[PDB]
Amino acid sequence: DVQLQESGPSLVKPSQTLSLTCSVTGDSITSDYWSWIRKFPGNRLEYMGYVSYSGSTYYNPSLKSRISITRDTSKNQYYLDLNSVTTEDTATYYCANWDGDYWGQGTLVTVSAA
Amino acid sequence: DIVLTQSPATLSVTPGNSVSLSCRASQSIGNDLHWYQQKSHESPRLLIKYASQSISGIPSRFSGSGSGTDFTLSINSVETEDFGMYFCQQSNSWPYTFGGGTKLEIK
Amino acid sequence: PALTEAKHQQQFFQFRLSGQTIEVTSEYLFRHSDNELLHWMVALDGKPLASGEVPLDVAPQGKQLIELPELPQPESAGQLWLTVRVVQPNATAWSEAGHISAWQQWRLAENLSVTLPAASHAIPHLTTSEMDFCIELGNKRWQFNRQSGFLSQMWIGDKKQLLTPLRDQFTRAPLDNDIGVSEATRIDPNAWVERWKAAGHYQAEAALLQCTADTLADAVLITTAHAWQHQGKTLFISRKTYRIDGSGQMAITVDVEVASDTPHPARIGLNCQLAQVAERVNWLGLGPQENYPDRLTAACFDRWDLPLSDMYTPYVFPSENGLRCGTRELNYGPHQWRGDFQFNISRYSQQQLMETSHRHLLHAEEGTWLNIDGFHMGIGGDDSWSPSVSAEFQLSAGRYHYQLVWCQK
Amino acid sequence: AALLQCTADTLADAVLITTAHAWQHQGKTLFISRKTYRIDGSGQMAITVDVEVASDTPHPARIGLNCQLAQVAERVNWLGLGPQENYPDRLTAACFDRWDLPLSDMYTPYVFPSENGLRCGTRELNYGPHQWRGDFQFNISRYSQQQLMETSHRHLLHAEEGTWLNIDGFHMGIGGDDSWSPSVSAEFQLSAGRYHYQLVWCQK
């Protein structure tokens, strides 16, 4: 069966690049479309984007070109890179397949000067 | 982008009673409206897809209805395990968007 | 990219321009233009001079007349183009708001340039040697190898610009249509590729016939001639002149002769590998998308600016791609080329394309590969298992002429 | 016409003349002609021509050069299509070869005088001591275009001082689907904008 899990820093500084990894086990990353979704402290959910089989990407315009979603078939993982983060990017990040049947556990990332 | 408005924002109910949650789109989205359940410290769980299609592994008491701009998620005889947040999400047009959520609590 | 060509050809509104009146014809059979706006616009070599918007009231199978405001007209040289677009102001169930459903463009006028450049302040120096000819002027220097007859290198300052000499190109990494059903096992002798292959196009060797430098009053003039041959057959002959002037501009003038009895070449132009790698490409010609000669009606003439990445078409089975026709000016880094040509530019040599079965196996090369074509044969497509390129799109004239102006900013 | 430029330069083994004119009417530049003449030790001049035609002007009937020769010879010999008058949309019956005919035969006595006698796909033409070489269409008689154009009947034409020669890099088709509306098919109209051609004039 399929399993997804997010990994990466839980604390980052303003202006830096937030980078998360989603490890997929149980099936190949070439067998689905992959997404990133985040939940803001106020219970607001935002669909950040997804990468489909051809490699084409779809990013939420709200991210003003700060986002990049890539894949690595050899490691069976896909990634999220969010540049120039601010306190507004503090949220719980989740990876899930496009169908929405498989989700990671989610990981909290806090953006603070401290 | 498509804006999804959910109502009521919060709903209190006593286990055993039934409830229906509303989600309305700013413009027609056909049947591309899905329902998610989310509990504290947990990832969202897909309950219904494409307005009314059932999902394997989800309790039968959950059903969805609607098309166009008005959708509803119904829970026939609420159980304690049902308390939490419910979000609708549309996939008709990019960017996909989520409703603000409806909190279901015990009364 | 084909998708656009379709979209445009299949559009439901049709236009005709008569004077300054546009005639619109609706191909809808049942509905009335009721979510349609017409945007119009005039521009001189990419520069906008005027815009309008007009709501369409045409019934199915009907006509609508549109008279345009008095159109500006400048003294400035260049081409004046009218471009119209139909827009869907409101969203439907299958379209977003502001969806464009049709378009068409026309050339309105041309003010030819009768202006001679400002007599060079400076004058280029030619330094001879037995290996080459060097031209210097300013920080700029150009070197032509006297053994090969090609411009082997060029510097801006201390920086070299080429990784590969600028040379004549008559082939192309075969499209699916050029190949057809030809296999290594079972060769289809009729497939374009086979013909080309068999005739030596892909492996012809150049031959310096001549290479001279001359000093002009205000410029240097290089003159060359090569013959491409295979098995003692001269396939083509290329005759050029490079003329560098006080402005530090080189003007290339090329003249090819193609043997009547050789399969017509896929193309005729030059290529070279640039040393630089820039983020954008800007050109004034057809676009924005990949366009070939028998496939360019959906493209518009204008000034386009895109990321390099967008100048490559990831066809799963790699082949020649990304061409843009009717280009008048192209800009990459500090370079600017001017004329009338078709071109393409990526990080993959034709050879790499030609030798990779899948796109996922391609690797970006050292710099930027540039192919500038005076001419390119059509792509065909009536079918993919027999020659489908119509005669009008085959390079069958024998004599071909073209000119360029390379320079910097 | 308008001289835009005219220069002479000395090459290692030849002289090089370079010119540019603009043809205009009411401040509109219709065409632009750019040439180079290059005379070499062989005593051969090579003319290279490059025209620019305004997109918005009716396409020209033709594009080439003409001049009036002083000589008058009895024959004309050429290597190209013939032997008969042939135009672009009317040359399938003609054959490529070496033809030799009397000058008189290079004129077509259409009762209502007009451009005539053209021969296409010529590679070499010989008249007197002259020889021109390249790829062109040409015509040659004792009547200027103007005289033709201004005479209602052929019987009123008079032979001019020498020989008028028209050498075309390009010529528009003649049409004929009908004679009361434009009948020249698009393929035969000089609509490219940019036109290039070269010649070699010389003697024997």
mmCIF file of N, CA and C in Angstrom, chain A residues 42-112:
data_model
loop_
_atom_site.group_PDB
_atom_site.id
_atom_site.type_symbol
_atom_site.label_atom_id
_atom_site.label_comp_id
_atom_site.label_asym_id
_atom_site.label_seq_id
_atom_site.Cartn_x
_atom_site.Cartn_y
_atom_site.Cartn_z
ATOM 1 N N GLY A 42 -5.209 29.924 11.176
ATOM 2 C CA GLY A 42 -6.621 30.224 11.348
ATOM 3 C C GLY A 42 -7.613 29.250 10.736
ATOM 4 N N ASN A 43 -7.175 28.023 10.469
ATOM 5 C CA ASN A 43 -8.039 26.999 9.879
ATOM 6 C C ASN A 43 -8.327 27.208 8.398
ATOM 7 N N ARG A 44 -7.502 28.003 7.728
ATOM 8 C CA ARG A 44 -7.695 28.242 6.306
ATOM 9 C C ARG A 44 -6.797 27.297 5.516
ATOM 10 N N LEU A 45 -7.384 26.595 4.552
ATOM 11 C CA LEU A 45 -6.642 25.661 3.708
ATOM 12 C C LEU A 45 -6.345 26.290 2.354
ATOM 13 N N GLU A 46 -5.145 26.046 1.840
ATOM 14 C CA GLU A 46 -4.741 26.582 0.547
ATOM 15 C C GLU A 46 -4.093 25.490 -0.282
ATOM 16 N N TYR A 47 -4.550 25.334 -1.519
ATOM 17 C CA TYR A 47 -3.973 24.335 -2.403
ATOM 18 C C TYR A 47 -2.808 25.066 -3.062
ATOM 19 N N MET A 48 -1.589 24.651 -2.737
ATOM 20 C CA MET A 48 -0.399 25.298 -3.269
ATOM 21 C C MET A 48 -0.100 24.956 -4.719
ATOM 22 N N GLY A 49 -0.206 23.681 -5.063
ATOM 23 C CA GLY A 49 0.049 23.285 -6.435
ATOM 24 C C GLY A 49 0.241 21.794 -6.587
ATOM 25 N N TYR A 50 0.465 21.350 -7.819
ATOM 26 C CA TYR A 50 0.703 19.938 -8.079
ATOM 27 C C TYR A 50 1.525 19.769 -9.337
ATOM 28 N N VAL A 51 2.151 18.607 -9.460
ATOM 29 C CA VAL A 51 2.946 18.289 -10.631
ATOM 30 C C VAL A 51 2.322 17.027 -11.223
ATOM 31 N N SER A 52 2.003 17.058 -12.514
ATOM 32 C CA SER A 52 1.403 15.895 -13.159
ATOM 33 C C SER A 52 2.455 15.018 -13.843
ATOM 34 N N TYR A 53 2.019 13.899 -14.412
ATOM 35 C CA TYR A 53 2.951 12.948 -15.011
ATOM 36 C C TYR A 53 3.922 13.466 -16.073
ATOM 37 N N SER A 54 3.496 14.426 -16.888
ATOM 38 C CA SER A 54 4.369 14.966 -17.933
ATOM 39 C C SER A 54 5.443 15.886 -17.360
ATOM 40 N N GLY A 55 5.254 16.310 -16.118
ATOM 41 C CA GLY A 55 6.212 17.204 -15.499
ATOM 42 C C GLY A 55 5.646 18.608 -15.432
ATOM 43 N N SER A 56 4.495 18.809 -16.067
ATOM 44 C CA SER A 56 3.847 20.114 -16.055
ATOM 45 C C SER A 56 3.446 20.428 -14.619
ATOM 46 N N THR A 57 3.591 21.688 -14.227
ATOM 47 C CA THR A 57 3.245 22.090 -12.876
ATOM 48 C C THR A 57 2.115 23.104 -12.881
ATOM 49 N N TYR A 58 1.413 23.172 -11.758
ATOM 50 C CA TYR A 58 0.316 24.110 -11.577
ATOM 51 C C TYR A 58 0.530 24.696 -10.193
ATOM 52 N N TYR A 59 0.706 26.007 -10.136
ATOM 53 C CA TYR A 59 0.945 26.686 -8.874
ATOM 54 C C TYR A 59 -0.150 27.699 -8.589
ATOM 55 N N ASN A 60 -0.495 27.857 -7.316
ATOM 56 C CA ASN A 60 -1.524 28.814 -6.944
ATOM 57 C C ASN A 60 -0.963 30.218 -7.184
ATOM 58 N N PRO A 61 -1.725 31.079 -7.873
ATOM 59 C CA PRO A 61 -1.259 32.444 -8.143
ATOM 60 C C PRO A 61 -0.943 33.217 -6.863
ATOM 61 N N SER A 62 -1.560 32.804 -5.761
ATOM 62 C CA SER A 62 -1.350 33.458 -4.479
ATOM 63 C C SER A 62 0.109 33.381 -4.041
ATOM 64 N N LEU A 63 0.838 32.416 -4.595
ATOM 65 C CA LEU A 63 2.237 32.214 -4.234
ATOM 66 C C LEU A 63 3.231 33.081 -5.007
ATOM 67 N N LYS A 64 2.701 33.979 -5.829
ATOM 68 C CA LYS A 64 3.511 34.915 -6.607
ATOM 69 C C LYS A 64 4.855 34.397 -7.124
ATOM 70 N N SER A 65 4.850 33.254 -7.803
ATOM 71 C CA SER A 65 6.082 32.707 -8.374
ATOM 72 C C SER A 65 7.175 32.303 -7.382
ATOM 73 N N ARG A 66 6.840 32.229 -6.100
ATOM 74 C CA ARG A 66 7.825 31.850 -5.095
ATOM 75 C C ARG A 66 7.906 30.336 -4.937
ATOM 76 N N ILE A 67 6.996 29.614 -5.584
ATOM 77 C CA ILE A 67 6.962 28.166 -5.434
ATOM 78 C C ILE A 67 7.499 27.322 -6.585
ATOM 79 N N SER A 68 8.101 26.198 -6.217
ATOM 80 C CA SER A 68 8.639 25.245 -7.173
ATOM 81 C C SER A 68 8.367 23.843 -6.646
ATOM 82 N N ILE A 69 7.810 22.988 -7.498
ATOM 83 C CA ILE A 69 7.533 21.609 -7.129
ATOM 84 C C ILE A 69 8.324 20.739 -8.096
ATOM 85 N N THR A 70 9.180 19.882 -7.551
ATOM 86 C CA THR A 70 10.009 19.014 -8.375
ATOM 87 C C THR A 70 9.924 17.557 -7.934
ATOM 88 N N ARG A 71 10.486 16.667 -8.745
ATOM 89 C CA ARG A 71 10.466 15.237 -8.453
ATOM 90 C C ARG A 71 11.823 14.574 -8.647
ATOM 91 N N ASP A 72 12.004 13.435 -7.987
ATOM 92 C CA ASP A 72 13.224 12.640 -8.096
ATOM 93 C C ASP A 72 12.761 11.183 -8.075
ATOM 94 N N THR A 73 12.632 10.596 -9.257
ATOM 95 C CA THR A 73 12.174 9.219 -9.376
ATOM 96 C C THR A 73 13.104 8.204 -8.721
ATOM 97 N N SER A 74 14.411 8.451 -8.784
ATOM 98 C CA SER A 74 15.381 7.530 -8.199
ATOM 99 C C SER A 74 15.233 7.417 -6.681
ATOM 100 N N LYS A 75 14.822 8.503 -6.036
ATOM 101 C CA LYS A 75 14.642 8.496 -4.588
ATOM 102 C C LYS A 75 13.164 8.343 -4.234
ATOM 103 N N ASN A 76 12.324 8.347 -5.261
ATOM 104 C CA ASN A 76 10.879 8.233 -5.096
ATOM 105 C C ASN A 76 10.377 9.280 -4.113
ATOM 106 N N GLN A 77 10.732 10.528 -4.387
ATOM 107 C CA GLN A 77 10.341 11.650 -3.549
ATOM 108 C C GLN A 77 10.009 12.849 -4.427
ATOM 109 N N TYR A 78 9.215 13.774 -3.899
ATOM 110 C CA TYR A 78 8.963 15.003 -4.629
ATOM 111 C C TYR A 78 9.144 16.118 -3.619
ATOM 112 N N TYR A 79 9.324 17.335 -4.105
ATOM 113 C CA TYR A 79 9.636 18.431 -3.208
ATOM 114 C C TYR A 79 8.858 19.716 -3.379
ATOM 115 N N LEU A 80 8.935 20.539 -2.342
ATOM 116 C CA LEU A 80 8.309 21.843 -2.319
ATOM 117 C C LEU A 80 9.392 22.835 -1.914
ATOM 118 N N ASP A 81 9.571 23.876 -2.718
ATOM 119 C CA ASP A 81 10.526 24.932 -2.402
ATOM 120 C C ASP A 81 9.710 26.207 -2.435
ATOM 121 N N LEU A 82 9.713 26.947 -1.333
ATOM 122 C CA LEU A 82 8.981 28.199 -1.266
ATOM 123 C C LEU A 82 10.021 29.250 -0.912
ATOM 124 N N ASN A 83 10.268 30.180 -1.830
ATOM 125 C CA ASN A 83 11.281 31.209 -1.602
ATOM 126 C C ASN A 83 10.757 32.464 -0.913
ATOM 127 N N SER A 84 11.686 33.241 -0.360
ATOM 128 C CA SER A 84 11.387 34.499 0.318
ATOM 129 C C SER A 84 10.179 34.422 1.247
ATOM 130 N N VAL A 85 10.197 33.468 2.167
ATOM 131 C CA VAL A 85 9.083 33.304 3.090
ATOM 132 C C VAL A 85 8.976 34.441 4.097
ATOM 133 N N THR A 86 7.767 34.627 4.622
ATOM 134 C CA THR A 86 7.502 35.651 5.627
ATOM 135 C C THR A 86 6.661 34.975 6.700
ATOM 136 N N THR A 87 6.302 35.716 7.743
ATOM 137 C CA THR A 87 5.503 35.149 8.821
ATOM 138 C C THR A 87 4.171 34.606 8.309
ATOM 139 N N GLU A 88 3.731 35.108 7.158
ATOM 140 C CA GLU A 88 2.472 34.675 6.555
ATOM 141 C C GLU A 88 2.544 33.243 6.033
ATOM 142 N N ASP A 89 3.758 32.715 5.926
ATOM 143 C CA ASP A 89 3.951 31.361 5.430
ATOM 144 C C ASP A 89 3.976 30.325 6.550
ATOM 145 N N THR A 90 3.770 30.771 7.786
ATOM 146 C CA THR A 90 3.739 29.847 8.912
ATOM 147 C C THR A 90 2.470 29.025 8.720
ATOM 148 N N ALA A 91 2.615 27.706 8.672
ATOM 149 C CA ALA A 91 1.464 26.840 8.456
ATOM 150 C C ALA A 91 1.842 25.372 8.559
ATOM 151 N N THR A 92 0.837 24.506 8.472
ATOM 152 C CA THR A 92 1.078 23.076 8.505
ATOM 153 C C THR A 92 1.069 22.656 7.041
ATOM 154 N N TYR A 93 2.159 22.047 6.594
ATOM 155 C CA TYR A 93 2.278 21.622 5.205
ATOM 156 C C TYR A 93 2.016 20.129 5.014
ATOM 157 N N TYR A 94 1.191 19.798 4.022
ATOM 158 C CA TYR A 94 0.869 18.403 3.735
ATOM 159 C C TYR A 94 1.133 18.054 2.286
ATOM 160 N N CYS A 95 1.562 16.820 2.044
ATOM 161 C CA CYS A 95 1.714 16.359 0.678
ATOM 162 C C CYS A 95 0.624 15.314 0.536
ATOM 163 N N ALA A 96 0.069 15.199 -0.662
ATOM 164 C CA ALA A 96 -0.998 14.241 -0.910
ATOM 165 C C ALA A 96 -1.045 13.987 -2.399
ATOM 166 N N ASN A 97 -1.615 12.858 -2.813
ATOM 167 C CA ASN A 97 -1.709 12.622 -4.240
ATOM 168 C C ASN A 97 -2.886 13.454 -4.739
ATOM 169 N N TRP A 98 -2.922 13.681 -6.043
ATOM 170 C CA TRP A 98 -3.957 14.484 -6.679
ATOM 171 C C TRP A 98 -5.382 14.008 -6.376
ATOM 172 N N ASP A 99 -5.580 12.693 -6.277
ATOM 173 C CA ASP A 99 -6.909 12.149 -5.991
ATOM 174 C C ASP A 99 -7.386 12.499 -4.584
ATOM 175 N N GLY A 100 -6.447 12.780 -3.685
ATOM 176 C CA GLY A 100 -6.817 13.113 -2.319
ATOM 177 C C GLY A 100 -7.004 11.913 -1.399
ATOM 178 N N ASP A 101 -6.699 10.715 -1.895
ATOM 179 C CA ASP A 101 -6.841 9.497 -1.090
ATOM 180 C C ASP A 101 -5.664 9.258 -0.157
ATOM 181 N N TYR A 102 -4.486 9.727 -0.558
ATOM 182 C CA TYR A 102 -3.285 9.545 0.244
ATOM 183 C C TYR A 102 -2.716 10.885 0.690
ATOM 184 N N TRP A 103 -2.553 11.039 2.001
ATOM 185 C CA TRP A 103 -2.011 12.264 2.573
ATOM 186 C C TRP A 103 -0.873 11.950 3.527
ATOM 187 N N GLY A 104 0.045 12.899 3.673
ATOM 188 C CA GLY A 104 1.143 12.724 4.608
ATOM 189 C C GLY A 104 0.559 13.099 5.960
ATOM 190 N N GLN A 105 1.343 13.019 7.026
ATOM 191 C CA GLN A 105 0.834 13.359 8.356
ATOM 192 C C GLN A 105 0.765 14.869 8.556
ATOM 193 N N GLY A 106 1.486 15.602 7.717
ATOM 194 C CA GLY A 106 1.513 17.047 7.823
ATOM 195 C C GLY A 106 2.646 17.471 8.738
ATOM 196 N N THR A 107 3.291 18.585 8.415
ATOM 197 C CA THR A 107 4.387 19.072 9.239
ATOM 198 C C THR A 107 4.286 20.578 9.438
ATOM 199 N N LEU A 108 4.371 20.999 10.694
ATOM 200 C CA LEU A 108 4.284 22.414 11.016
ATOM 201 C C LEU A 108 5.603 23.113 10.734
ATOM 202 N N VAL A 109 5.525 24.236 10.029
ATOM 203 C CA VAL A 109 6.700 25.033 9.705
ATOM 204 C C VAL A 109 6.422 26.442 10.198
ATOM 205 N N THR A 110 7.260 26.926 11.109
ATOM 206 C CA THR A 110 7.085 28.263 11.648
ATOM 207 C C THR A 110 8.162 29.201 11.120
ATOM 208 N N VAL A 111 7.732 30.346 10.600
ATOM 209 C CA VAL A 111 8.654 31.340 10.072
ATOM 210 C C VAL A 111 8.777 32.454 11.098
ATOM 211 N N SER A 112 9.946 32.556 11.719
ATOM 212 C CA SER A 112 10.171 33.576 12.732
ATOM 213 C C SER A 112 11.599 34.105 12.711
#
